[PDB]
Nucleic acid binder design. Structure first.
Lengths: 413, 261, 182, 263, 169
RNA sequence: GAGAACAGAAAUCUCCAGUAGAACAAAAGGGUAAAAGCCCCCUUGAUUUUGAUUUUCAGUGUGAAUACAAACCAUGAAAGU
RNA sequence: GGUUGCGGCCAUAUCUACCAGAAAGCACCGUUUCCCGUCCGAUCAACUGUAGUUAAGCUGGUAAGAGCCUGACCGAGUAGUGUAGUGGGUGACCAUACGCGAAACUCAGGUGCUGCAAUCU
């Protein structure tokens, strides 16, 4: 090993002298690993902590049987079954009353957390494998009604789903290529990326009618994201994790948590961002204008992920150049470039306190950065192969990760 | 008589079977080529109808305990039976872990940032090192309680000696006491008289094999809720016990009663 | 209450031994054994010296490392430790240095000739007329294979080979004892 | 046979010597209070410490051979022979060696006012931490006898010479002070060995990070009286201080470059 | 009174000290295997005997311990060859006893001619509750004299069942 | 010491007694006691590089040994070794 | 004041025969569904506390009991031992001094204290 060169003898003589006397809510960072959890014999493709508690968690994989996990015991809990193809993606409802996942097969299957049994007949209609999912935010939802579940597929069509009737209340085919992702914003206007090098805001309130079509990327859009996505995903589940006493209380708490972040500038205008393969990223304010507020750029290779900070003050994105790049959340201005990964980054998840950002890459050793110091915090080796996915618990008590090693691993302070 | 004079007496702690100095020396006497740091041993022990686990730190005056827990506190958490079993040991380990984590202020010298998550070297003492031992379940419970005790998974129950794989479902069934449920189901169809003898409290309380998992889950939730370590009411004063001991303790005879004889 | 401390003569510091020395004149009256307060003044002086040392030790740069799981002897990333300068207080050595080196009558001849140190690449060497390597030392040796062969084509020759090996071993031990003599 | 090789490597002049072992030697005249003071001093010396239950009649000032023999047999270059007599009451003849040969000797008879560790607050005192030192008085840096006592206490209590140390391990601080200033040619004032447990509190008036320090004595308390003394011969002083020793216009530039200079 | 210290067997230990090394030791072990139902453990020679032609470390004998209710059945089966008449000897002062018998085939099991004729040693060992303290890894200790087994207690247990007589004073 | 078919003073088996005249390469000799002795399970290592000496002459950011120190190794639950 | 876990000193702590242990806490104990290992569920591993026992281990008390230990200005600043002087003698060596400085022996005493957490009529 090439150890750091020993200090010069003059440096030791200087160190011998007296020196440098001068009379003149928070999440604990993860720093340690946990026992591996054996499970289905296939590489994990996705993971998502339960919004209401870190003890529950679920992960997809190449095995058809999704496996919920009891993080407190690091043991399998009520393994899911029914799919006949790979579980390409998984997502929890913001209320937490129902789970949703997207199989490589066209079928989609809601699940009940209390037992893991499938919630009715599998959703169907897509001509190609599911790409992403986005539950409707609870604050938009009226009390006493289950949130709608957005869906997307490689064909590029999107079909809003009514979870109660298990039927597609709406459908669209405005994208000529695959929809890389979709998200349900809190303003009531849908947004989604596409492989056709185009983005199209949609107004679900107007029977799904389209209203705008962005067109600035030189290459296909990837991983569309919004500053409000954290509040829209957590479902008004504060870090304490207490369940609201009534559904109307849940609606009020969700509207309050959304207004707290939407009005950071004194006005309700959530920021939006869209990663692209052209080594560029663009801030977006679709309600304000059809053109980007700024053209973020600098990565030497295609960005693989983007994630707004929970407060929205900062933007960050994974890249194939092995150097995550922070950006300002208000204007997209460059801040600092993280480094250390030996291989292309895949995805990252912001800490609930916003002071840290867990990350993973094709290199077996996932890492987490302390954004406040703009420097690496602590490496997290242990995975035997690529860490395809990582996620942070909403309370911050624990972190989970998957990979090609077929050995799920949890992490906590 | 010369044999009594020549031989040197074994150390009184060695004269007891409760300790083995050869292991305690390595447990305490760090080399210590690594940079010096404070260290504490997570002592663990077992006894009939009871379990004991406590953190400890070396001192010139003798070992000092930073925290302690016992199986007898389990019923307050709803574990009214099975205190000696594997799942009860895992529960006692999670209890001591949450208790030390709460007393340490980790949740619910500020310099040299203090979150400094706690770690300890568990010590089973003379208990045999074998896979599936309940002491290993108490260690797994301490590891799940936020304490960070290093340990390979080889000794956890359900381990396959022929491969690195470890079954997690068996570990969950052991943590929940499911082996006791299997023993009860086996007794239900086998000779009933052993069922009438064993688990007499589970039948007197109308306990059933299906409910043991929910009972252990509620006990874990109670351990997560209030690990305050409530002191016993101690109804009688200690002076009353000291007076009661005098009535029967055999005080040494006065010299006046023996020198004359 | 304030941590600040000062003396007319600045305290000497040796941060490597975690030691400090105070040349300031002691008060003979406070140190008298008869005084009941003698312990208190010495305690206050030791407290002031420890406060000065902590003010010095706390200023030293601290190491940091990202390694946290699987480190053999590395410090935890949450942990931080002072970079102690090497001590300035020389102390007597425990034992004399092992300066009793000897050429053993061979290194001089090697310096006098073109001979070079052995490659030290590995004991293993391929066996002749065989599909598997036979190490020449540290394991089953081909040199001892001659005893195991069913025929030598020539007193038993294997006994002569063992006698030659014992002769070489005794010659090496004799050369070692002769180098021990000098 | 390999096990003997490890003992031989331990009994060798390593370029970075391991911390010297201690071997207290109770005397035939030793009083039980002297044995208690010896156990108290040994408790600070752990783990590098040893004991011998057998009583001995060693006379280091009259015959050093037995001490040199025991130092080699026990691999303990340090030694502290307990002794007592009608004149040299509660004698404590500390000893040091270089190569198992005698290096120096000095008497440190305990004062009658000594206090055992048990007669102090029962504060925690983790074993194996390196004590801090806080010498006091100008004579320690000038008087050859006090300089020898300081070097002896440092070699005995400094512990491992680690290149890095946690702040958490500074749980205690050894302390010593001479019994006042003295004019040259006066009898040497008795040394006042002391120990204290460290304490810390928020300052609020001396920096955002520096905490207020406080001390709580734990002992053992002792007030050694100086007596007979012996010093190494100058050739021993030269051999014992030599560095292991294991370049102009050249330096190791940062990043490992060996940049030169023409000047 | 002696409620908690009732006499009871600790274990039965059959043994066969064969007089010569060879394959016959395998059949001698198979005899104990078929008798006790468990695999015999081989016993290597204690040292260089040299008084019978055996060498050190050579196998000479086999034995197998027995416990539980079945041990009493083998005990009675071996006593039947003894005619339920022990000698005044064959009794340890500590409270143990044993005996051997020629022609083990007589004790119940079929002659099985291929196995061949063989005798077998027997040595029962009495014990009392609390004997576990002597062997337990934790809190190991001795036993009190009042609880210690004695030859009189062994003779009393022998008269407690099987109606065995003590022949040859 | 009491004992065990053949089996006795020397076979193998059992119970109570042992500061260990057990086997620890050992020599003056201190000493090893839930081992440094007996039994059982898993395993390479003559691995890589950083410096200070060693002679060389395609003398070479080491081309190779010696010593230094870091990774890597085996084991255990770990301390640690 | 009794007791469990960890300990410090390491025989004032160990060995032999008896007696007591009220209440509380080990232990003995009952079992082989499961993890686990032995020829043997004897030890080890596990099962709940169910049928019991203070009979043992264990805590205390007794003994002209065996060893051990403490301090006394007890031997004693004694014996032993280096030092000077031709002080006596051919001399070895002997009195005179301050140093280092014992032990056998004698006297009196004892047959375990002590820290942390917990518990007990």
């Amino acid at each position: 090993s090439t150890l750091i060169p020993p200090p010069s003898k003059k440096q030791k003589k200087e160190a011998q002298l007296p020196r440098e006397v001068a009379i003149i809510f928070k999440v604990k960072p993860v720093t340690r690993s946990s026992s591996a959890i054996a499970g289905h014999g296939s590489t994990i493709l996705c993971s998502a902590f339960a919004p209401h508690t870190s003890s529950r968690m679920v992960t997809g994989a190449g095995d058809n049987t999704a496996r919920i996990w009891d993080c407190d015991t690091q043991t399998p809990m009520h393994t899911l079954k029914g799919h006949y193809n790979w579980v390409l993606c998984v997502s929890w409802s913001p209320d937490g009353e129902v789970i949703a996942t997207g199989s490589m097969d066209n079928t989609i299957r809601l699940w009940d957390p209390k037992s893991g049994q499938c919630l009715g007949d599998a959703l169907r209609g897509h001509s190609k494998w599911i790409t992403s999912l986005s539950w409707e935010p609870i604050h938009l939802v009226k009390p006493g009604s289950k949130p709608r579940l957005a869906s997307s597929s490689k064909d590029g069509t999107i079909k809003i789903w009514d979870t109660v009737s298990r039927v597609c209340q709406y459908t669209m085919s405005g994208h000529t290529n695959s929809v890389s992702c979709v998200k349900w914003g809190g303003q009531g206007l849908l947004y989604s990326g596409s492989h056709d090098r185009t983005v199209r805001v949609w107004d679900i309130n107007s029977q799904g009618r389209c209203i705008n079509i962005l067109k600035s990327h030189a290459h296909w859009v990837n991983h569309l994201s919004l500053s409000t996505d954290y509040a829209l995903r957590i479902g008004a589940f504060d870090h304490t994790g207490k369940k609201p006493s009534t559904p109307e209380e849940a609606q009020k708490k969700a509207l309050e948590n959304y207004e707290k972040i939407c009005k950071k500038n004194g006005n309700s205008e959530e920021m939006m961002v869209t990663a692209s393969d052209d080594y560029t990223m663009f801030l977006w304010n679709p309600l304000k204008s059809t053109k980007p507020i700024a053209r973020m750029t600098g990565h030497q290779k295609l960005v693989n992920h983007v994630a707004f900070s929970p407060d929205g003050r900062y933007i960050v994105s994974a890249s194939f150049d092995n150097s995550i790049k922070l950006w300002d959340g208000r204007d997209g201005k460059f801040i600092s470039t993280f480094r250390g990964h030996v291989a292309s980054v895949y995805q990252v998840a912001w800490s609930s306190d916003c002071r840290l950002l867990v990350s993973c890459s094709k290199d077996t050793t996932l890492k987490v950065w302390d954004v406040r110091t703009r420097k690496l915090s602590v490496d997290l080796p242990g995975h035997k192969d690529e860490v395809y996915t990582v996620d942070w618990s909403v309370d911050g008590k624990r972190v989970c990760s998957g990979g090609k090693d077929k050995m799920v691993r949890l992490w906590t302070h | 008589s010369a044999y009594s004079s020549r031989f040197q007496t074994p150390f009184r702690r060695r004269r007891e079977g409760k300790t083995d100095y050869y292991q305690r020396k390595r447990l305490v006497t760090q080399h210590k080529a690594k940079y010096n740091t404070p260290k504490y041993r997570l002592v663990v022990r077992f006894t009939n109808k009871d379990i004991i686990c406590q953190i400890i730190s070396s001192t010139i005056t003798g070992d000092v305990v930073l925290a302690a827990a016992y199986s007898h506190e389990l019923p307050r958490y709803g574990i009214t039976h099975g205190l000696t079993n594997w799942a009860a040991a895992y529960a006692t380990g999670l209890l001591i872990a949450r208790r030390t984590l709460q007393k340490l202020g980790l949740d619910e010298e500020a310099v040299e940032d203090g979150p400094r998550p706690f770690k300890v070297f568990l010590d089973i003492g003379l208990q045999r090192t074998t896979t599936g031992a309940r002491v290993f379940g108490a260690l797994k419970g301490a590891s799940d309680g936020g304490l960070y005790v290093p340990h390979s998974e080889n000794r956890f129950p359900g381990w396959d000696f022929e491969t690195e794989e470890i079954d997690p479902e068996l570990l969950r069934s052991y943590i929940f006491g499911g082996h006791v449920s299997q023993y009860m189901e086996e007794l239900a169809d086998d000779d009933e008289e052993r069922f009438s003898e064993l688990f007499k409290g589970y039948l007197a309380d109308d306990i059933d094999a299906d409910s043991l998992e929910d009972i252990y889950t509620s006990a874990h939730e109670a351990i997560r809720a209030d690990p305050a370590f409530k002191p016993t009411e101690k109804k009688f004063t200690k002076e009353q016990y000291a007076a009661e001991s005098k009535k029967y303790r055999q005080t040494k005879l006065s010299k006046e009663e023996r020198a004359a004889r | 209450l304030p941590v600040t401390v000062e003396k007319p003569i600045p305290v000497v510091y040796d941060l490597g031994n975690l030691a400090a020395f105070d040349s300031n004149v002691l008060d003979k009256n406070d140190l008298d054994s008869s005084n009941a307060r003698r312990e208190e003044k010495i305690k206050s002086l030791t407290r002031d010296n420890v406060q000065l040392l902590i003010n010095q030790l706390l200023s030293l740069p601290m190491k940091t490392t990202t390694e946290s799981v699987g480190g053999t002897g590395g410090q935890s990333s949450v942990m931080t430790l002072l970079q102690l300068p090497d001590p300035t207080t020389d102390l007597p050595r425990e034992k004399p240095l092992p300066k009793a080196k000897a050429m053993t009558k061979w290194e001089k001849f090697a310096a006098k000739k073109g001979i070079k140190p052995k490659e030290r690449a590995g004991k293993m060497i391929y066996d002749e007329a065989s599909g598997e390597w036979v190490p020449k030392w540290g394991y089953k040796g081909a040199n001892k294979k001659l005893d195991d062969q069913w025929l030598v084509e020539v007193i038993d020759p294997r006994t002569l080979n063992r006698a030659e090996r014992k002769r070489l071993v005794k010659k090496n031990e004799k050369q070692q004892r002769r180098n021990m003599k000098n | 046979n390999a096990r003997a090789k490890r003992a031989l490597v331990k009994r060798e002049a390593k370029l970075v010597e391991n911390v010297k072992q201690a071997l207290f030697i109770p005397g035939q005249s030793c009083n039980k209070n002297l044995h208690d003071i010896m156990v108290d001093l040994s408790a600070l010396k752990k783990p590098d410490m040893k004991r011998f239950n057998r009583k001995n009649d060693i006379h280091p000032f009259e015959d050093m051979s037995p001490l040199e023999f025991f130092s080699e047999k026990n691999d303990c270059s340090l030694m502290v022979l307990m002794t007592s007599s009608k004149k040299r009451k509660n004698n404590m003849t500390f000893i040091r060696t270089f190569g198992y040969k005698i290096y120096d000797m000095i008497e440190l008879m305990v004062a009658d006012n000594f206090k055992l560790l048990s007669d102090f607050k029962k504060l925690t005192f983790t074993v194996g931490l390196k004590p801090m030192f806080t010498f006091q008085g100008a004579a320690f840096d000038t008087h050859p006898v006090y300089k020898q006592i300081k070097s002896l206490f440092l070699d005995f209590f400094r512990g491992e010479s680690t290149d890095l140390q946690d702040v958490a391990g500074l749980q205690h601080v050894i302390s010593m002070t001479i019994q006042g200033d003295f004019q040259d040619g006066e009898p040497l004032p008795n040394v006042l060995f002391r120990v204290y447990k460290l304490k810390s509190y928020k300052s609020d008036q001396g920096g955002k990070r520096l905490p207020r320090i406080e001390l709580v004595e734990i002992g053992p308390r002792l007030d050694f009286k100086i007596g007979r003394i012996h010093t190494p011969s100058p050739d021993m002083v030269t051999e014992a201080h030599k560095k292991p020793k294991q370049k102009k216009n050249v330096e190791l530039d940062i990043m490992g470059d060996k940049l030169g200079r023409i000047h | 009174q002696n409620p908690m210290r009732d006499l009871k067997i600790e274990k039965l230990v059959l043994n066969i000290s064969v007089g010569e090394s060879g394959d016959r030791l395998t059949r001698a072990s198979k005899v104990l295997e078929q008798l006790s139902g468990q695999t015999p453990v081989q016993s290597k020679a204690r040292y260089t005997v040299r008084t019978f032609g055996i060498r050190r470390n050579e196998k000479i004998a086999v034995h197998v311990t027995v416990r539980g209710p079945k041990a009493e059945e083998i005990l009675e089966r071996g006593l039947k060859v003894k005619e339920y008449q022990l000698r005044d000897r064959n009794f340890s002062a500590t409270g143990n006893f044993g005996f051997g018998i020629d022609e083990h085939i007589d004790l119940g099991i079929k002659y099985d001619p291929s196995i061949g004729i063989f005798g077998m040693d027997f040595y029962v060992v009495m014990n009392r509750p609390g004997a576990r303290v002597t062997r337990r890894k934790r809190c190991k200790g001795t036993v009190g004299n009042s609880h210690k087994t004695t030859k009189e207690d062994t003779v009393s247990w022998f008269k407690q069942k099987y109606d065995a007589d003590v022949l040859d004073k």
